[PDB]
From Swiss-Prot, chain A:
Protein name: Large ribosomal subunit protein uL15
Organism in which the protein naturally occurs: Thermus thermophilus (strain ATCC 27634 / DSM 579 / HB8)
Chain positions covered by the region annotation Disordered: 1-50
Signal peptide: none
Subunit field text: Part of the 50S ribosomal subunit.
Function in brief: Binds to the 23S rRNA.
Family stated for the protein in its record: Belongs to the universal ribosomal protein uL15 family.
Ranges of biased composition (kind: Basic residues): 30-39
Biased composition (Basic and acidic residues): 44-50
UniProtKB/Swiss-Prot annotation, chain C:
Keyword Ribonucleoprotein set for record: yes
Molecular function, one GO term: rRNA binding
One GO CC annotation: ribonucleoprotein complex
Subunit structure, as described in the record: Contacts protein L20. Part of the 50S ribosomal subunit.
Organism: Thermus thermophilus (strain ATCC 27634 / DSM 579 / HB8)
Keyword Nuclease: no
InterPro entries noted in UniProt: bL21-like, bL21-like_sf, Ribosomal_bL21
Keywords: Ribonucleoprotein, Ribosomal protein, RNA-binding, rRNA-binding
Protein name: Large ribosomal subunit protein bL21
Recorded name of the encoding gene: rplU
Family, similarity comment: Belongs to the bacterial ribosomal protein bL21 family.
Pfam families, alphabetized: Ribosomal_L21p (PF00829)
Purpose of the protein: This protein binds to 23S rRNA in the presence of protein L20. Found on the solvent side of the large subunit.
Curated annotation (Swiss-Prot), chain E:
Protein name: Large ribosomal subunit protein bL20
Stated family: Belongs to the bacterial ribosomal protein bL20 family.
NCBIfam families: rplT_bact
InterPro entries reported for this sequence: Ribosomal_bL20, RIBOSOMAL_L20_CS, Ribosomal_protein_bL20_C
Molecular function as annotated in GO: rRNA binding; structural constituent of ribosome
Lineage of source species: Bacteria, Thermotogati, Deinococcota, Deinococci, Thermales
A GO cellular component entry from the record: ribosome
Organism: Thermus thermophilus (strain ATCC 27634 / DSM 579 / HB8)
Gene Ontology biological process terms, A to Z: ribosomal large subunit assembly; translation
Protein task: Binds directly to 23S ribosomal RNA and is necessary for the in vitro assembly process of the 50S ribosomal subunit. It is not involved in the protein synthesizing functions of that subunit.
Entry keywords, A to Z: Ribonucleoprotein, Ribosomal protein, RNA-binding, rRNA-binding
Curated annotation (Swiss-Prot), chain G:
Gene Ontology process terms (BP): negative regulation of translation; translation
GO molecular function: mRNA binding; structural constituent of ribosome
SUPFAM superfamilies from the UniProt entry: Ribosomal protein L13 (SSF52161)
Cellular component GO terms held in the UniProt record: cytosolic large ribosomal subunit
Quaternary data: Part of the 50S ribosomal subunit.
The protein's role, per its UniProt record: This protein is one of the early assembly proteins of the 50S ribosomal subunit, although it is not seen to bind rRNA by itself. It is important during the early stages of 50S assembly.
InterPro entries: Ribosomal_uL13 (IPR005822), Ribosomal_uL13_bac-type (IPR005823), Ribosomal_uL13_CS (IPR023563), Ribosomal_uL13_sf (IPR036899)
NCBIfam families the UniProt entry points to: rplM_bact (TIGR01066)
Protein name: Large ribosomal subunit protein uL13
Keyword line: Ribonucleoprotein, Ribosomal protein
Keyword Ribosomal protein: yes
Gene that this polypeptide is encoded by: rplM
Source taxon at top rank: Bacteria
Family of the protein in this entry: Belongs to the universal ribosomal protein uL13 family.
Length: 50, 48, 100, 154, 115, 110, 137
RNA sequence: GGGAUGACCCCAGGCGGUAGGGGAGCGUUCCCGAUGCCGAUGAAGGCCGACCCGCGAGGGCGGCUGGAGGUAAGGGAAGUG
RNA sequence: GGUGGAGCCUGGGAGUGAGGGCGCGAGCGAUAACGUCCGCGUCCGAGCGCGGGAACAACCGAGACCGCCAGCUAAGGCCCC
RNA sequence: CCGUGAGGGAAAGGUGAAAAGAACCCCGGGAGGGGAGUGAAAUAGAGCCUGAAACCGUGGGCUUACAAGCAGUCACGGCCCCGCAAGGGGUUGUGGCGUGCCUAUUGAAGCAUGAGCCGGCGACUCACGGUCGUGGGCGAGCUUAAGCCGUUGAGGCGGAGG
């Protein structure tokens, strides 16, 4: 082995969800939050488990 | 009140406005006595 | 003399020596291709039926192409939907040798 | 925006000036305003399971041993450290400086003799780590060291 | 590490403006009016690729129909005659025949009127 | 062979002076000389200087023969604008731009 | 294989009597001729197509009550500036014009359709300029 | 299915799409790779291009400019479009 | 019978909780409303992509993976535009 | 600089290895330029590295004064250019087609929001818990925390605890 070939297994990095970069790219604009009120708002909702 | 332009006028529509803005050169006669050039019906700048 | 032949779901008017581009057909470059037994003579009478049966056109497969890229774009206003796709269409280039 | 220099003052009355609408100029929407979600000091450490470092150490040696690139030596004699003296013992050792070498010995004199070679990295045995095994083409230990590397695994 | 815009956004805009070369006024000069014009020009191109196929056929027909009205019949009967005669040759594209090869065209009229 | 003078940072509005430069272009230096004298705009003063500096540049530098000079090319580009505050009613304060011309006369032989 | 398109053709000329031909039925034909849609090299963007001369206008006949009942309208830019001219008065005043307006309305709109109209020359009764060619109906 | 246990060939199907879910990728800054490699016979950046590769985001290549930097394969992390 | 982008079970992520036109069944209205309220269906919503209806979200036709200067049709059309 | 005052509060870096920072001459009142000279380079000339875009200008090709429009697109033709050529680049005469982008809405070209244009800044993060998944380690077990030793980009130890 050497540092060139080290690398991780095919699971194990994933490497995550952007949100709010371009259209198409999926998430974009509304950033998966979808159209107005409280849940889209910054502090969002009231703690739904109660 | 207070009229205002509704759209920035285009580079073309303004330059078209200026289609009349060109100067015409001064109209000049050669001086009967002196060598030089004069507007007619005026007194020569050299040798009145 | 001329011939009206059919290749790739399309009909073209071939004289001998004419180079022409055609929906891509399966054969090596330089192989010889016998074009389906076609539709018309340039000496007239021979027309007939779907196809005059047994008279042929032979053409040399000159090589295989890919056409100049066409950009296929799709845009839907106020829905935030755009797609951009390049497409270039495979072809085969032929030389018309003789009309049999 | 809370940590930037500027005032807390509202810049404009908020209605009727014909302009957009603002707070303090510390707001991240202003040039010179605060950053949003940018870096703060953080500690990147985590605790890798000891068994996993133990194994990966063993495995990393093994990978070198299975290449035949491990060599254990006794005593040097390229000691009393002078990189000239080490360079001799290294010649007889067949290490020509054509492959990076990781040299593990507790002998401070041999260590400093090799320290300055571009192709040598050196360690006390108690600091054997896998990152240095993998960086180096050849692994070289003495008979101490290798003894404690052994007692360290298991 | 901070990754600022740097070179990227300029290149993106330059790309579009190259595509907009030749458009009127700001539509070639301004990244936005360029981008807007392109959206159009891209859906028009797709629409008119679809409809170039229609546009050409309509011309062939007017020309076919014109030439066999010279020989005294319709387009509509003529096509039936050829459907009858098995002559599904014509592929209206060959009104090339109708113009350059008149006597070939005439023999096709005849084969058509026998039905 | 050509000769050129450029007056730079001439404090005048390009549109205004460009208009007289338009008067003398492709003209023989002798009529250009007359036109500027009897053209009434502050722009003739300036172009005249550049003209002359370029005609002078022709004879003493590029070996160009004064009698054969005409204006082969010429133009005014627009230098940096001096900006000043103009106080208005109800506390207002606009900015007038006092603008700047870079005048170029380029001479050639007929 | 590209579709054929003419190089410059030479204009043919035609002459029609129009006496007793009806109106829209004559106009239909004059239209197709003007366009050149009989010529089977016809092309939409060109203006290849016959010039047309018509004599014995004023002698067009029409069916129904249209001589009294059919009105042509003309709007000036001005208030109340809509003029209503009944067919009979037109024929009695500017016969032709009745064919001209019938063919104009039947040619395509545009710069080219406006040129084709220039190639229709309509006269009342007989004669005309004689130095072109002109076959018949 | 082919028995290459395939990374490909053949056959048959599906492939409008906002909210939204899922999946693959492009690029940007930084790190290891790096005491290395590219570089004045010209780095980055800029301006062109009708050429090549890529579905695309992009990557090349040539010319001009520029005059001191740049940074592979493979992986890591983010003030990343 | 039906192998279907069917069904059922467990669990991760949602978004939605302003609907609208049309048809048919009612109520309210005046056997008014481009009215209003329910029911069953549909389409627009998201198919303001395509053909027809002069033009026109939802009426008729038809579910647009890409390319073709090939063919057959739908609705609607075939005097000229 | 703004505010009576508490107080608010900016912009603004880069010639060149080296000033060798352009003597002298010419136009000019100066400014500026033109030669000369320096320099590897002077569109490195001090309003100085690179020098993008909006914006303005000179010159050249095609084009346009009986046509009408979200400015394009598809076709054919003219002229100009590159080429060996069926080739391609430019431009646009005529013909077909064609209701800007974003936002918000049941529904917008909409006579509903937003935007003069260009460049640069600009918004899903981090910590600690949780709960799922996934990659690995060990598995009736798993695992250390604070510390301590070592190292100076070396790791180990530590079993309280959970
Ligand atoms: Mg997604
Ligand atoms: Mg979505
Ligand atoms: Mg969500
Ligand atoms: Mg919103
Ligand atoms: Mg919500
Ligand atoms: Mg808040
Ligand atoms: Mg809140
Ligand atoms: Mg639209
Ligand atoms: Mg959109
Ligand atoms: Mg504060
Ligand atoms: Mg503060
Ligand atoms: Mg402060
Ligand atoms: Mg306060
Ligand atoms: Mg306002
Ligand atoms: Mg500030
Ligand atoms: Mg700051
Ligand atoms: Mg090394
Ligand atoms: Mg090394
Ligand atoms: Mg940095
Ligand atoms: Mg940014
Ligand atoms: Mg079709
Ligand atoms: Mg048929
Ligand atoms: Mg005042
Ligand atoms: Mg005051
Ligand atoms: Mg202003
Ligand atoms: Mg398929
Ligand atoms: Mg889809
Ligand atoms: Mg679907
Ligand atoms: Mg080298
Ligand atoms: Mg050199
Ligand atoms: Mg960089
Ligand atoms: Mg470069
Ligand atoms: Mg690098
Ligand atoms: Mg950010
Ligand atoms: Mg389902
Ligand atoms: Mg679920
Ligand atoms: Mg509710
Ligand atoms: Mg809502
Ligand atoms: Mg409700
Ligand atoms: Mg409802
Ligand atoms: Mg009914
Ligand atoms: Mg209703
Ligand atoms: Mg009702
Ligand atoms: Mg009702
Ligand atoms: Mg419904
Ligand atoms: Mg909606
Ligand atoms: Mg909608
Ligand atoms: Mg649907
Ligand atoms: Mg509409
Ligand atoms: Mg319609
Ligand atoms: Mg419709
Ligand atoms: Mg529809
Ligand atoms: Mg489909
Ligand atoms: Mg003060
Ligand atoms: Mg310096
Ligand atoms: Mg020199
Ligand atoms: Mg330069
Ligand atoms: Mg320089
Ligand atoms: Mg500057
Ligand atoms: Mg430098
Ligand atoms: Mg500079
Ligand atoms: Mg510029
Ligand atoms: Mg010009
Ligand atoms: Mg007229
Ligand atoms: Mg004209
Ligand atoms: Mg057009
Ligand atoms: Mg908006
Ligand atoms: Mg709203
Ligand atoms: Mg509303
Ligand atoms: Mg509403
Ligand atoms: Mg409007
Ligand atoms: Mg609006
Ligand atoms: Mg309003
Ligand atoms: Mg509103
Ligand atoms: Mg911007
Ligand atoms: Mg998150
Ligand atoms: Mg967590
Ligand atoms: Mg978690
Ligand atoms: Mg496990
Ligand atoms: Mg210590």
């Amino acid at each position: 082995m050497k540092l060139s070939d080290l690398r991780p297994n095919p699971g194990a990095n994933k490497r995550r969800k952007r949100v709010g970069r371009g259209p198409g790219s999926g998430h974009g604009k509304t950033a998966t939050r979808g159209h107005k009120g409280q849940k889209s708002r910054s502090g969002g909702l009231k703690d739904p488990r109660r | 009140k207070h009229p205002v332009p509704k759209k920035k006028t285009s580079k073309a529509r303004r330059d078209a406005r200026r289609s009349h803005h060109a100067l015409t050169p001064p109209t000049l006669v050669p001086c009967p006595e002196c060598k030089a050039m004069k507007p007619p019906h005026t007194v020569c700048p050299e040798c009145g | 003399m001329f011939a009206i032949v059919k290749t790739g779901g399309k009909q073209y008017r071939v004289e001998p020596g004419l180079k022409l581009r055609v929906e891509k057909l399966d054969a090596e470059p330089g192989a010889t291709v016998e074009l389906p037994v076609l539709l018309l003579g340039g000496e007239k009478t021979v027309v007939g039926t779907p196809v005059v049966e047994g008279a042929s056109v032979v053409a040399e497969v000159l090589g295989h192409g890919r056409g100049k890229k066409i950009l296929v774009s799709k845009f839907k206003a106020k829905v935030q939907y755009r797609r951009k796709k390049g497409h270039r269409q495979p072809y085969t280039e032929l030389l018309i040798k003789e009309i049999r | 925006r809370g940590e930037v220099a500027y005032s807390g003052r509202k810049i404009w009355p908020q209605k009727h000036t014909g302009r957009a609408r603002h707070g303090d100029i510390g707001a991240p929407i202003f040039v010179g305003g605060g950053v949003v979600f940018g870096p703060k000091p953080r500690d990147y450490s985590y605790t890798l399971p000891k068994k996993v470092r133990k194994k990966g150490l063993a495995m990393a040696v093994a990978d070198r041993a299975r290449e035949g690139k491990l060599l254990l030596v006794e005593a040097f004699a390229g000691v009393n450290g002078k990189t000239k003296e080490f360079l001799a013992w290294a010649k007889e050792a067949g290490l020509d400086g054509s492959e990076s070498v990781l040299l593990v010995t507790g002998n401070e004199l041999v260590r400093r003799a090799a320290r300055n070679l571009p192709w040598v990295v050196t360690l006390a045995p108690e600091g054997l780590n896998v990152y240095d095994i993998v960086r180096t083409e050849r692994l070289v230990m003495d008979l101490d060291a290798w003894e404690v590397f052994q007692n360290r695994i298991g | 590490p901070r990754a600022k815009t740097g070179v990227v956004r300029r290149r993106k805009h330059k790309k579009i403006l190259k595509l907009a070369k030749g458009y009127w006024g700001l539509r070639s000069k301004s990244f936005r009016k360029a981008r807007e014009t392109l959206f159009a020009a891209g859906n028009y191109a797709y629409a008119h690729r679809k409809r170039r196929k229609r546009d050409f056929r309509r011309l062939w027909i007017v020309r076919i129909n014109a030439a066999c009205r010279q020989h005294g019949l319709n387009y509509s009967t003529f096509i039936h005659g050829l459907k009858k005669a098995g002559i599904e040759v014509d592929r209206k594209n060959l009104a090339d025949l109708a113009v350059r090869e008149p006597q070939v065209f005439a023999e096709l009229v005849e084969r058509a009127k026998a039905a | 062979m050509e000769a050129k003078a450029i007056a730079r940072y001439v404090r005048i509005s390009p549109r205004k002076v460009r208009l007289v430069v338009d008067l003398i272009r492709g003209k023989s230096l002798e009529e250009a000389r007359n036109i500027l004298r009897y053209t009434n705009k502050r722009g003739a003063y300036f172009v005249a200087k550049v003209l002359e500096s370029a005609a002078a540049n022709a004879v003493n530098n590029h070996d160009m023969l004064e009698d054969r000079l005409y204006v082969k090319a010429a133009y005014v580009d627009e230098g940096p604008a001096l900006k000043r505050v103009l106080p208005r009613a109800r506390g207002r304060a606009d900015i007038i731009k006092k603008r700047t011309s870079h005048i170029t006369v380029i001479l050639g032989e007929k | 294989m590209k579709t054929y398109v003419p190089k410059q053709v030479e204009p043919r000329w035609v002459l029609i009597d129009a006496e007793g031909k009806t109106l829209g039925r004559l106009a239909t034909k004059i239209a197709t001729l003007l366009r050149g849609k009989h010529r089977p090299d016809w092309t939409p963007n060109v203006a290849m197509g016959d010039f047309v001369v018509v004599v014995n206008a004023d002698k067009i006949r029409v069916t129904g009550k249209k001589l009294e009942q059919k009105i042509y309208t003309r709007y000036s830019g001005y208030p109340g500036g809509l003029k209503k001219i009944p067919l009979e008065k037109m024929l009695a005043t500017h016969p032709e014009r009745v064919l001209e307006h019938a063919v104009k309305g039947m040619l395509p709109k545009g710069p080219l359709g406006r040129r084709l109209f220039k190639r229709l020359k309509v006269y009342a009764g007989p004669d005309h300029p004689h130095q072109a060619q002109r076959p018949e109906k």
